[PDB]
């Protein structure tokens, strides 16, 4: 629904690549089941498409270098309307009442939760400068460094660069990026931040109508 900067861009998918927010036109990303699907629209975390019946669903988009895919084993089912079991909607017939995922992003009753994200470990920050570990946080971003060499290091408030000469191996230090500013969905594939994390509600678009 809109791009990495945060301003409304018509049909564009926005994703996260290793901490950097990137964008790609929505016609460049394809998904499919047993047969190819057609994206109808997208809004926030949600996407509305026409899909045929399949035992799984994959999403693919190709960058200028590499191809990103993701297949999940969620059955997609095609539910005919009435007492004639078709597999593709007919060209002509009679009108019957049905419930379909509407193509509107307006705020109906449904909601999900947006929570405070947990710290995401990044091993690219840690380097070996002079036979000693060096943490170089990204431009204008904190990075909590935890190390278990001689003397435990819990050094949080570093913003520019630090050298922990106590630890001589990169494998015994962990640098966690801190964001604490933009609230992520309460997903189960992300670590949970400490303390109370519920920060708001996101309306669910494309509800059944």
């Amino acid at each position, epitope marked *: 629904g809109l791009d990495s900067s945060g301003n409304l861009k018509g049909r564009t998918m926005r994703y996260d690549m290793h901490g950097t927010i990137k964008e790609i036109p929505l016609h460049q990303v394809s998904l499919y089941t047993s047969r190819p699907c057609h994206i109808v629209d997208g809004h926030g975390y949600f996407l509305l498409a026409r899909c045929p019946a399949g035992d799984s669903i994959t999403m693919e988009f190709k960058k200028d270098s590499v191809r990103h895919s993701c297949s999940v084993p969620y059955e997609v089912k095609f539910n005919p309307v009435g007492r004639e079991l078709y597999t593709h909607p007919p060209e002509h017939g009679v009108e019957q009442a049905c419930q379909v995922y509407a193509h509107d992003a307006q705020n109906r009753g449904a909601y999900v939760e947006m929570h405070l994200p947990g710290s995401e470990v990044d091993s690219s920050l840690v380097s070996l400068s002079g*036979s*000693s570990v060096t943490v170089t946080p990204p431009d204008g971003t904190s990075a909590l460094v935890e190390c278990e060499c001689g003397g435990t290091k819990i050094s949080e408030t570093i913003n520019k660069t630090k050298q922990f*000469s106590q630890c001589t191996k990169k494998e015994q230090c962990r640098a966690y990026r801190l964001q604490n500013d933009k609230w992520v969905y309460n997903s189960d594939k992300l670590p949970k931040a400490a303390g109370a994390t519920l920060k708001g509600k996101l309306h669910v678009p494309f509800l059944l109508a």
Partner: antibody
Amino acid sequence: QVQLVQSGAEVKKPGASVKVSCKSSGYTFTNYIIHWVRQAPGQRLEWMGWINAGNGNTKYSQKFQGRISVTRDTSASAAYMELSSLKSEDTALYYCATLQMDYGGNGDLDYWGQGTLVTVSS
Amino acid sequence: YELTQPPSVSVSPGQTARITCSGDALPKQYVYWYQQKPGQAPVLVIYKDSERPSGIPERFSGSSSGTTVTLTISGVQAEDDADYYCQAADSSNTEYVFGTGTKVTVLQ
């Protein structure tokens, strides 16, 4: 408890190398770095070099090349600093600096030597 | 590359005193403040630009604004007199440099 003690006062005529030894012990010395620095009397400090125990590699100051050399022995856990081609202005106070109580790695040097300021003592 | 620090400052007891330190790439590195007593080795007073080690009175504080790093002392008293040095790594970060030094003194 970090304790480094260096050699006593030694006065010597200009034109030859001076060897000052500072030995450090009382703390985990696997990879900690000890800094040689020279301060003129009543003037700013002038960082000279840094020595790593295990690595045994030193980056010399931009102003001093060749005439400064690094000597270190694990047996005494000591560093030996020799400064050849000494001049009249090169006679100054000397310090060996090292971390004492740890909240980080380098850049946090808390413990220092007593000093080796020297003058005629005949 | 060098750190520009005034030769000395004059402050009366009971009021805050400021020491300024400047560097071209300074907002990219960390500065550390050292207190040198008369005839004594320098002692670190402020590390990581904002905090003070244990045993250092709370009066000392540090602030960073891009090029300018300010060391602030609140309620200056008798034994606060000393030389203050801001030291930090160079742009290449391999070599360390020190400030000129401020002689904080009391006129009365």
